[PDB]
Amino acid sequence: EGCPTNGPKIPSIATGMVGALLLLLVVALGIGLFMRRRHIVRKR
Amino acid sequence: EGCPTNGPKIPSIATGMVGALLLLLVVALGIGLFMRRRHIVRKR
Known part of the structure; x- marks a missing residue:
């Protein structure tokens, strides 16, 4: 309408x-x- | 001088x-x- 660029x-x-950003990550x-x-990760 | 950024x-x-939402989830x-x-070492 006037400045769609930015x-x-x-x-x-x-x-x-x-709230959505934080919830999304979680x-x-x-x-x-x-x-x-x-629960038991292998060992090198 | 009045700029609530509304x-x-x-x-x-x-x-x-x-882009941030998708990247965040990933x-x-x-x-x-x-x-x-x-693995997770102790005393961290």
Whole structure:
């Protein structure tokens, strides 16, 4: 409408962004350890 | 001088958000599997 190229804005929506970002990372980690299904790691 | 940085919308900044969200999830998963196969020394 005026400047589609750029336009940084930090509205109140940040709540969902910050919460989603943190939750997302936690979800990935959990799944990784879950799928692994291993408690006794091998020894070199 | 009045700059709450308000602006609830979907600007071009989405590029970084979408890319960061996907990359973040991938980072968490990798670390999880890495740490799982990585022993943990005591006194750390």
